[PDB]
Amino acid sequence: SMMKWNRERRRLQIEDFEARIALMPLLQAEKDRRVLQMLRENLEEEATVMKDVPGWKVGESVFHTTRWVTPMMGELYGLRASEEVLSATYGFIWYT
Amino acid sequence: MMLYIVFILSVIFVMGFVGFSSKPSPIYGGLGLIVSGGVGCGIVLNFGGSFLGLMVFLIYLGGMMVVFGYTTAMATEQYPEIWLSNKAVLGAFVTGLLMEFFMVYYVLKDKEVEVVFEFNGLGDWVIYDTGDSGFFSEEAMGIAALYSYGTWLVIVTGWSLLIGVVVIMEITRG
Amino acid sequence: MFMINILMLIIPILLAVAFLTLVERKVLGYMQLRKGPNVVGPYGLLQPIADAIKLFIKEPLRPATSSASMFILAPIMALGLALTMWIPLPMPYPLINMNLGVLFMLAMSSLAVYSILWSGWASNSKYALIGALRAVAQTISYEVTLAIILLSVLLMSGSFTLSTLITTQEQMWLILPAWPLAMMWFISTLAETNRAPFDLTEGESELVSGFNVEYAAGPFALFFMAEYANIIMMNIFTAILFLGTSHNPHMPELYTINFTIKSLLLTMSFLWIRASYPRFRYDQLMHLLWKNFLPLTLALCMWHVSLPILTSGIPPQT
Amino acid sequence: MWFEVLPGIAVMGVCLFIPGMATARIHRFSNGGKEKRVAHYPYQWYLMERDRRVSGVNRSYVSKGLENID
Amino acid sequence: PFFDVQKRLGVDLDRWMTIQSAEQPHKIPSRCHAFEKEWIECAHGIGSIRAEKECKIEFEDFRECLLRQKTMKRLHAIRRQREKLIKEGKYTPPPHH
Amino acid sequence: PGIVELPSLEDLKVQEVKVSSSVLKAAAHHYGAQCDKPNKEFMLCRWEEKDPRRCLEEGKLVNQCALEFFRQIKRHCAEPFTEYWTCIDYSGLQLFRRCRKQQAQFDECVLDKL
Amino acid sequence: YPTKETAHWKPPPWNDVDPPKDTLVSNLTLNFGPQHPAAHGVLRLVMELSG
Amino acid sequence: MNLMLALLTNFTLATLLVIIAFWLPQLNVYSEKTSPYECGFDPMGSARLPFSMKFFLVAITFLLFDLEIALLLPLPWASQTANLNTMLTMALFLIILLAVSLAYEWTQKGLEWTE
Amino acid sequence: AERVAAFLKNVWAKEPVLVASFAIAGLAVILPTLSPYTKYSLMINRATPYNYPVPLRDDGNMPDVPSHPQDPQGPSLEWLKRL
Amino acid sequence: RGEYVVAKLDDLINWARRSSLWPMTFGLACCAVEMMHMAAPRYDMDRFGVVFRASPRQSDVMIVAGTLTNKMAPALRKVYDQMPEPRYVVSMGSCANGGGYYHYSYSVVRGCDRIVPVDIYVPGCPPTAEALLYGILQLQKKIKREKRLRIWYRR
Amino acid sequence: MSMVYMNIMMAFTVSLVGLLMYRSHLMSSLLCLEGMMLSLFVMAALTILNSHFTLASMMPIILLVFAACEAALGLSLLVMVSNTYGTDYVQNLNLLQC
Ligand SMILES: CCCCCCCCCCCCO[C@@H]1O[C@H](CO)[C@@H](O[C@H]2O[C@H](CO)[C@@H](O)[C@H](O)[C@H]2O)[C@H](O)[C@H]1O
Ligand code: SF4
């Protein structure tokens, strides 16, 4: 009985996973725009914070290569309310 | 104050270490090694180490129990020492705690400390990964791979434990 | 509204425990041709509330030689951890949904044993210490077998999540494909909970209350409350593992009905087992666990690694 | 008689039934009549956090459907 | 290795975990996979003496992707300046920050 | 090092797909079949480039195709569909298993209407 | 080279078997009763115990 | 937060009961009440004297066996690998190697307590 | 070989727990070979899709890769459905 | 009125104490047998809430059930002192009541009331199981008449 | 480095100093040993968990396997040291000076 039921549960898991594979392009498109949206807002509201600082170049990369480097939580959520940061950081771990 | 959970837990992690490193009776030393091992689960848990956090906690829990059994049998004394009943232990305990407090005060105040080496106190959240979304914990995949990938590790560890049982038989039986 | 949900968990547990001290006395009485409490309230229904009140208005004696801090620490740690091993339990919705519920339950039952070890040590009494070290011997007896027996059953469920065990047993219970593990799991729950025939850390006919022989009043109640809370918890965990009940999301209450019934019937069998057998010798406990259960528990662990592979019935990771 | 042990068992059972009934009621109450969403894996959390943004009221359990498409 | 038997016998006893850009279960990528891969390709076959001088850029980036020491000093400067202008009441954050 | 190039907030603007999770999952096996060309073309770019700032126009055509997909559902039989994803929405794990009776209505309708 | 700080060192045993100690690894002495359910109420059973 | 609140509530309640237990009753403490208990007669020696461990060998082997189970909890996940040949062999190898370790300890009289 | 066939009775008489455990252990090591289903377990674990199935860049030389998910190329799971 | 509140918080604690007496498991001689019979099925002391508990710390009542010899006197006073308050002593049998049939012996204490303060004297050699039960229920009525809080309110 | 490392490494150093500064009981010095591996365990996991380097998630586990072996090996030697002198004191282990 655990043969047949576990085989069935594997077919139900494949079905669950396929549905994910259908929607991933959509959630990848939204994620790309969201990331760039947040970075651009940070830059705009970081040139004004440091307009009076000598030597600062707004938006200067720390990496020599011009490749695209995925931002870490600090860069992406650096200037935001702790409500968002905490949800973005430990929200999933702490969920129940 | 919740963005600094990983820092607060680490502070307790050290405080627990100073508790048993100053070396009172192994009864309280084991107590301080239980607390450090439990908040050690807490630190590893916040980083995604759910399985790893609970394994060090569960393993160290049974480890100290045997040590409690062995202390009563062999490392006891008429007047077990606590941290406040010995000038050497109290010196080690106070020296350790103050050394930690100055670290905490400076790093928090200046958002950076330089205890020999540079450390950045913006908070541990700044370095986490921003993106992820798969039906799995990458931690479990890595540990689960120990059997398909780490055949060599399995053999040397499994062999070491088997020799471990032979070793303790020979050592104790004299 | 979470804090409200914690209280709706804690308070019924204390009430359920208070009345398991009445159901036990009554069942043991009728199994002994007597009646058990029937004076203090109709059918002795108020007997728990005279036990509890009486203990908390009785002066608590702190032994002169005891270690004050850890003497007081131990009882709080017992009742504290006893209520914690409930939050992951799905009934059918757990208070806290853990991806590693089963480990978290093993970890808490390991940490709970330090209530006995420190309480006996903090007592600074020879009978307290002798009982405290009977807790060490007992833990070494059952932990290796307890962990493997759990492991051999999760190889059929496919995860450590406790709710996933409900989906696993939607067709037939897990006591059909694992009645050997069930038999050993039940025994190891008796030894984990310090219940007769494995009541060795208290051993009244041997050590006069054992580890908690210097405790009185409220601090002694906390050790009595904690032990009975763990009786219910381990049998609720036993009803989940091997007697899975069908969960219907639109009418969840029906799960709790059949679920509670199975955990009273199992909780009664602890009571039944207490009246039927003598007591083990604590050195005969390790030989039972190490020279019978452990060899058969290892052999069934290899069996339940092979079986899903040679039948194609490997459960989903999800 | 043995049936005089049943009053104690009833009171016990009705005390063990409450913990499980309260959780289902509260979860239902605080999620708009639905089960609390389970997120065992990072993927489901992403869908959860997305539902909170798609809701427009910062509640992940408020569901928007076709009527919301323009 | 001291006795490089693994290459002689063609058995991978432990190379599969030495680097984090190797094949991984389910093709889960490491965070700094690209930063490592570039440093490895740059410095492959030329030796540590030349690599310490010739692949400097790739290793500096790789070191940056790991310990983010430079990234967090930039962030620290921004927060320190911003928390200075607020205490002076000169800067106002938008609703979304 | 240079300035991290970044797109303008003007060019990051698209008509988002604002339907909750249960709507997507309930309309996923059909979505995979119908919008497979823009999706697979966008995703190929996304590994090929390894840069989000490049595959942005292709990340538009993924959305516009998705909106059209949910529109055809709305025009024809959105009532069997709303009866469907409300049953998915109920479950804590959003299980296809607990709604095969409400799913057959939605599946068979589109097999007639579209 | 003899020295004050080594004036009390002695040559080791010929077979490297330092003589066994006479430590009085004494037993725990416990009062088993009178007040004890197994002591029948009036038996003080003193017991030297090794564990 | 949800988990920490549950822990904080669980232990706060226990602390409150112990607080009520110690400050609510009428206390009357004197020297003879608090003396260590030992069946009505003064104890002979300290409870802190050494207490021989007769399962000292089994307790050690428990640590090593405790570690084996930590090498086997990955097994439910390890069974989801497409490379099941290697997993199964190496899985039955640790259990059998563990089983042998118990056989050697059992036969060499290591399980029997010292006398 | 009567010596072992009588050695089984003695152990079965004295220590039936060991007799049961070894027999269970032997089957856990032997039946994996002698099964027409042990092959499927590998097949199913490799049919579960955890990552994205990334598309290939069509170049007019790979007629073995389906152009659409509902195309009659690629591998099937009908063996799994009817299993 | 405060006098009413104490009158019902004093009924309460008295009810709790008398409805849950846990005697120390402690019998000296013959009279311990009748004490077992009080716990045996015919009389079932448990049905009244009475549960023997070995430890003095967890006990409420000491039933002195047998002869108290001079050797035993220090121990009976040790375990008594180790009972948390409130504690009550029931003197059961003639030997405990006042020496009984060894009154003129050289090794006997002539009544346990020379050592501990006694609340009830159950006469008989031994008191039948029912005579001891009458004494226990008479102790319950004594606790029912205590007025700790009423006397504190008027202190 | 991140501010979590400031304290994990501060934990290792204390436990190392704790080891190198003996007192009386040999047991206490074995707990400092266990203290180190715990800190080494936590340090490895953070680095490995943060880098998303998956295959080394089995590294901290293998660390624990040989951590208990030294704990077991130490407790075997502490038993034999006790039997000889009735205590675990390190002052007694001074025959080999000469
Ligand atoms: C003292 C050390 C003791 C170590 C003891 C180790 C014993 C291990 C015995 C082998 C256990 C696994 O046994 C092995 O498992 C695989 C799949 O899992 C089985 O089945 C496999 O066989 C072939 C392999 O091409 C295929 O049909 C298919 O991949 C699969 O069915 C094999 O028939 C068997 O060789
Ligand atoms: S009173 Fe009577 S029955 Fe009781 S001990 Fe004395 S002689 Fe025996």
J–A contact (≥3 CB pairs within 8 Å)? Answer: no
Going by C-alpha positions, the residue among I25, C37, K81 that lies closest to residue D5 is: C37
| Interchain CB contact of F55 with A (< 8 Å) | yes
Calculate how far, in angstroms, residue J29's C-alpha sits from the geometric centre of ligand 2. Answer: 7
Rounded to an integer, what distance in angstroms lies between the CA atom of residue C254 and that of residue C246? 9
Residue type, A70: T
Tokens representing residue E30 in the block: 């490491």
| Ligand found nearest the CA of H79 | 1
With a Cβ cut-off of 6 Å, ligand 1 is lined by C 309; H 84-85, 88-89, 92-93, 96; I 29, 32-33, 38-39, 42
The phi, psi pair for A53, rounded to 5°, reads -100, 130
Q: In angstroms, how far is CA E6 from the centroid of its own chain?
A: 28
Residue K85: list chain G partners with CB under 8 A.
Answer: 21, 23
Residue type, A12: L
CATH number (domain holding residue H26): 1.20.58.1610
Nearest Cα residue to atom 5 of ligand 2: J66
User: What is the CB-side half-sphere exposure of residue J82 using CA atoms within 13 A?
Assistant: 27
Asked whether the CA dihedral A54, A57, A59, A65 is positive or negative, the reply is: negative
The atom number, within ligand 1, closest to the CA of I33 reads: 33
Tokens representing residue G38 in the block: 């197994």
- C167, C314, C318 ranked by CB distance to A16: nearest: C318
Specify the 3-state DSSP secondary structure of I69.
coil
Q: Which domains are seen in chain B, by residue range?
A: 4-169 (1.20.120.1200)
**CA distances to C21, C178, C197 from C293, in Å:** 31, 14, 16
Q: DSSP character for G48?
A: E
| Structural domain boundaries in chain K | 3-85
Beta-sheet strand order (sheet of J120-122): J61-65, J88-92, J120-122
K–C contact (≥3 CB pairs within 8 Å)? Answer: no
Rounded to an integer, what distance in angstroms lies between the CA atom of residue B173 and that of residue H17? 49
Chain breaks in chain H (C to N over 2.5 A) after: none
Going by C-alpha positions, the residue among J5, J3, J8, J1 that lies closest to residue J154 is: J3
8 Å CB contact between D50 and F21: yes
8 Å CB contact between J90 and J136: yes
With a Cβ cut-off of 6 Å, ligand 2 is lined by J 29-31, 66-67, 93-95, 100-101, 125-126
Q: Helices then strands (H, E): number in chain C?
A: 12, 0
Question: Residue C196 — left, alpha, or beta (φ > 0 → left; ψ -120 to 50 → alpha)?
Answer: beta
Rounded to an integer, what distance in angstroms lies between the CA atom of residue C262 and that of residue F15? 54
Calculate how far, in angstroms, residue C215's C-alpha sits from the geometric centre of ligand 2. Answer: 33
8 Å CB contact between A64 and E61: yes
> Which residues, in sequence order, are CB contacts of C25 under 8 Å at separation 6+?
C36, C37, C44, C47, J46, J51
Domain holding H82, by residue range, is 7-107
K–B contact (≥3 CB pairs within 8 Å)? Answer: yes
Rounded to an integer, what distance in angstroms lies between the CA atom of residue C182 and that of residue D63? 43
Domain K3-85 fold: Helix Hairpins (1.10.287)
Query: How would you classify the pairing of strands B119-120 and B112-113?
Result: antiparallel
Rounded to an integer, what distance in angstroms lies between the CA atom of residue I71 and that of residue I63? 12
Strand partners, J23: J61
Specify the 3-state DSSP secondary structure of J92.
strand
Calculate how far, in angstroms, residue C19's C-alpha sits from the geometric centre of ligand 2. Answer: 39
Rounded to an integer, what distance in angstroms lies between the CA atom of residue C15 and that of residue D18? 11
Rounded to an integer, what distance in angstroms lies between the CA atom of residue K46 and that of residue B116? 21
| Ligand found nearest the CA of J93 | 2
Specify the 3-state DSSP secondary structure of H50.
coil
Q: Do A96 and H1 touch (CB under 8 A)?
A: no
Going by C-alpha positions, the residue among E19, E40, E18, E45 that lies closest to residue E30 is: E19
Residue type, J46: D
Rounded to an integer, what distance in angstroms lies between the CA atom of residue C137 and that of residue H63? 13
> Which residues, in sequence order, are CB contacts of G20 under 8 Å at separation 6+?
none
Rounded to an integer, what distance in angstroms lies between the CA atom of residue D47 and that of residue B134? 11
Helix-strand-coil split of chain D, %, nearest 5:
65, 0, 35
Scanning chain H, the segments in alpha helix (DSSP H) are 2-23, 56-72, 75-78, 84-107
Q: Do E74 and A72 touch (CB under 8 A)?
A: no
| Interchain CB contact of F44 with A (< 8 Å) | no
Tokens representing residue B66 in the block: 């045997």
8 Å CB contact between C222 and H16: no
| Structural domain boundaries in chain D | 1-70
Rounded to an integer, what distance in angstroms lies between the CA atom of residue J12 and that of residue C53? 9
Tokens representing residue E86 in the block: 């607020």
The phi, psi pair for K77, rounded to 5°, reads -70, -30
**CA distances to B64, I63, I64, I65 from I72, in Å:** 62, 11, 10, 10
8 Å CB contact between C30 and C271: no
Which resolution, in Å, applies to this structure?
3.1
At how many degrees (to 10) do helices C101-123 and B50-74 cross? 20
Indicate which technique resolved this structure. Answer: cryo-EM
H interface with G, Cβ–Cβ < 8 A, is 38-41, 43-45, 49-54
Q: Do B136 and D46 touch (CB under 8 A)?
A: no
Q: DSSP character for C93?
A: S
8 Å CB contact between J81 and J16: no
Rounded to an integer, what distance in angstroms lies between the CA atom of residue F25 and that of residue F31? 9
Rounded to an integer, what distance in angstroms lies between the CA atom of residue K55 and that of residue B148? 11
Q: In angstroms, how far is CA C106 from the centroid of its own chain?
A: 11
Asked whether the CA dihedral A20, A22, A26, A31 is positive or negative, the reply is: positive
What is the number of CB-based contacts under 8 A between chain A and chain I?
A: 21
Rounded to an integer, what distance in angstroms lies between the CA atom of residue K77 and that of residue K80? 5
What is the number of structural domains in chain H? 1
Residue where the block lists tokens 């199981």 = J129
Tokens representing residue K88 in the block: 């675990």
Q: Which long-range contacts (CB under 8 A, 24 or more apart) does F47-56 make?
A: F47/I54, F48/I57, F50/A67, F50/A68, F50/E34, F51/A67, F51/A68, F52/A32, F52/A35, F52/A36, F52/A68, F53/A36, F53/A68, F53/F5, F53/F6, F53/F7, F55/A32, F56/A32, F56/A33, F56/F7, F56/F11, F56/F12
Tokens representing residue B3 in the block: 């963005």
Asked whether the CA dihedral K4, K10, K12, K15 is positive or negative, the reply is: negative
The answer to the question of whether J31 is labelled as a binding residue is: yes
Going by C-alpha positions, the residue among C298, A89, H81, C306 that lies closest to residue I31 is: C306
Q: How many CB atoms lie within 10 A of CB E80?
A: 14
Going by C-alpha positions, the residue among B122, I40, C57 that lies closest to residue J12 is: C57
Q: DSSP character for H90?
A: H
Nearest Cα residue to atom 4 of ligand 2: J31
Calculate how far, in angstroms, residue H90's C-alpha sits from the geometric centre of ligand 1. Answer: 10
Question: Residue J49 — left, alpha, or beta (φ > 0 → left; ψ -120 to 50 → alpha)?
Answer: left
8 Å CB contact between J82 and C61: yes
The phi, psi pair for E30, rounded to 5°, reads -70, 155
Q: Do K76 and B13 touch (CB under 8 A)?
A: no
Rounded to an integer, what distance in angstroms lies between the CA atom of residue C191 and that of residue C293? 13
Nearest Cα residue to atom 2 of ligand 1: H93
Rounded to an integer, what distance in angstroms lies between the CA atom of residue C96 and that of residue C86? 9
Residue where the block lists tokens 């007629």 = I63
Q: How many CB atoms lie within 10 A of CB C251?
A: 10
Tokens representing residue E88 in the block: 């002076």
8 Å CB contact between D8 and C41: no
What is the number of CB-based contacts under 8 A between chain B and chain I?
A: 4
Q: Helices then strands (H, E): number in chain A?
A: 3, 0
8 Å CB contact between B151 and H90: yes
**CA distances to H40, H71, H79, J73 from J70, in Å:** 14, 64, 74, 5
- Longest C-alpha distance within chain H, in Å? 72
Specify the 3-state DSSP secondary structure of J69.
strand
In H, residues 9-38, which contact C (CB 8 Å cutoff)?
A: 9-11, 13-15, 17-18, 20-22, 24-29, 31, 33-38
Q: Do H37 and J85 touch (CB under 8 A)?
A: no
8 Å CB contact between H53 and H59: yes
Question: Residue F55 — left, alpha, or beta (φ > 0 → left; ψ -120 to 50 → alpha)?
Answer: beta
| Interchain CB contact of E84 with B (< 8 Å) | no
Query: How would you classify the pairing of strands G45-49 and G28-32?
Result: antiparallel
Specify the 3-state DSSP secondary structure of J23.
strand
Beta-strand ranges (E) seen in chain B are 112-113, 119-120
- A65, A74, A81 ranked by CB distance to E75: nearest: A74
**CA distances to C101, G7, G9, K94 from G4, in Å:** 67, 5, 10, 18
**CA distances to B122, B156, B162, K7 from B119, in Å:** 9, 37, 43, 10
Rounded to an integer, what distance in angstroms lies between the CA atom of residue C1 and that of residue F108? 42
Tokens representing residue A43 in the block: 């830059």
8 Å CB contact between C100 and C160: yes
| Interchain CB contact of J53 with C (< 8 Å) | yes
The CA angle I38-I42-I45, to the nearest 5 degrees, is 130
The phi, psi pair for J126, rounded to 5°, reads -85, 165
Question: Residue E47 — left, alpha, or beta (φ > 0 → left; ψ -120 to 50 → alpha)?
Answer: left
For chain F, which chains pass the contact test of at least 3 CB pairs under 8 Å? A, C, D, I
In a domain, H91, yes or no: yes
> Which residues, in sequence order, are CB contacts of C149 under 8 Å at separation 6+?
C181, C184, C185, C188, C297
Whether a cis peptide bond, with omega within 30° of 0, leads into C48 is: no
In H, residues 1-40, which contact A (CB 8 Å cutoff)?
A: 1-3
J62 membership: H or E segment, kind and range: strand J61-65
| Interchain CB contact of C45 with J (< 8 Å) | no
In a domain, H45, yes or no: yes
> Which residues, in sequence order, are CB contacts of D19 under 8 Å at separation 6+?
C8, C9, C12, C13, C86, C91
| Interchain CB contact of I38 with C (< 8 Å) | yes
At how many degrees (to 10) do helices B151-172 and H84-107 cross? 0
